[PDB]
Amino acid sequence: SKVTTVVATPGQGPDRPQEVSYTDTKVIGNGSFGVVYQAKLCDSGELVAIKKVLQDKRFKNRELQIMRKLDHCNIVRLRYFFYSSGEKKDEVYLNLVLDYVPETVYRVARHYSRAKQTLPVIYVKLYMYQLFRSLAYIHSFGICHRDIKPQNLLLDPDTAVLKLCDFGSAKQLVRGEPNVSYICSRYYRAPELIFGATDYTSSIDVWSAGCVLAELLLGQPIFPGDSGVDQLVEIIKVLGTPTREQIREMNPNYTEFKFPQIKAHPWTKVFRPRTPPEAIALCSRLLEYTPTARLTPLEACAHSFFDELRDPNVKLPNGRDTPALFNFTTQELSSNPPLATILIPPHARI
């Protein structure tokens, strides 16, 4: 087959380029970003994904700058990066060589939906916990993903490992600095975003994660609608009408606009009867109008819902051991170091 050799800089460590050779190049994605390819490294045989984006000469790429700073088991690793000329002549392309993760939460949730089944609760705990770990990590550097949704949550079906991807919308949120409100995908957008707030915090990712949890429990999105107004009606139907105080906490320019007075629906009636109460309690605490009232990713990791993961006897349906879940760093725990008493169970240290 066709072998491509490049002089690629490693993602982490010293800026010491290396000759990287790859083959079996197939397109696996095409979006607003650019093209995502799958390729096989000639040396190891290891599979990788290559994200190709057109680079302006104007400034450095924000996604690369973010990717270069990250190293977490629940985040797709930037292995290398290199420049090329691909489709258009006289223009540069930045190529991000990333870890290849075979499946998405989106496709898996879709399989179960189609078969009129729900994803077993063990997987809901494994996938959600791992998402909150990745969130605790990026948030500790002040970085907000801004596009949390099932399509951006990659899975290894054999190892039950989840890895966060797509750092195209990611930004370091600095207090007092304004940010675009038009980020985030329909169904997963926090009410502050729907209200066009430019002063939002990293708690927008928490709302999105909460929407993902409720969807895995229901078998469909919790807040659907093709307009902000329809989405808001669906939110109000569950959470009840937001107070004048709750509106101020999201966007204070929408306080004088009247809303339909709907009663605060009991969260227990939202989900099927078999739904564990700790799962319902977790949604309740993540899907809050007041951005500050939402659990943090690290607090979410420590929630009762994830206790089965901390059991020393927990195993995968395939018999294998659970992936890494307790290897927390000082950085990862920085928001609340005492939480490590809950997070790291006695059997963990080895």
Of 7 and 54, nearer to a second copy (C-beta) is 54
The residues, any chain, with a CB within 8 Å of residue 179's CB and separated by 6 or more, are 171, 173, 198, 199, 200
In the residue annotation, 166 being an active-site residue is answered as: no
C-beta closer to a second copy: residue 156 or 234: 234
Question: Residue 62 or 77: which CB sits closer to a second copy?
Answer: 62
What are the φ/ψ torsions at residue 101 (nearest 5 degrees)? -115, 120
Strand ranges, E, within 120-240: 143-144, 153-156, 161-164, 171-172
Binding mask 154-173 for a second copy (x = CB under 8 A): ---------------x----
Looking only at residues 242 through 301 of this chain, which bind ligand KDI when binding is defined by CB under 6 A?
none
Which of 228, 276, 323, 345 forms a contact with a second copy (CB under 8 A)? 228
Say how far apart CA 269 and CA 283 lie, in whole Å: 13
Rounded distance, CA 301 to CA 323, Å? 15
35 is in an annotated binding site: yes
Question: C-alpha 102: how far from its chain's center?
Answer: 16
**266 contacts a second copy (rule: CB under 8 A):** no
Q: Which does 98 bind (CB under 5 to 8 A by kind): a second copy, ligand KDI, none?
A: ligand KDI
| Contacting range for a second copy; rule: CB under 8 A; set: 97-105, 120-128, 158-166, 189-197 | 189-197
Residue 143 binds which of a second copy, ligand KDI, none (CB < 5-8 A, kind-dependent): none
Of 28-36, 203-211, 281-289, 299-307, which part binds a second copy (CB under 8 A)? 28-36
Residue among 180, 264, 293, 324 that touches a second copy (CB under 8 A): 180
71, 147, 156, 166: which one is catalytic?
Answer: 147
- Scan residues 116-155 and list those touching ligand KDI (CB under 6 A): 151-152, 154
CB-based closest residue to ligand KDI: 165
Q: How many CB atoms lie within 10 A of CB 217?
A: 24
**How many CB atoms neighbour CB 266 within 10 A?**
9
Three-state secondary structure call for residue 267 = helix
Element (H, E) at 213: helix 203-218
Query: Residues 6 or more apart from 229 whose CB is under 8 A from it?
Result: none
> Residues comprising the binding site for ATP?
28-36, 51
List, by residue number, the catalytic residues: 147
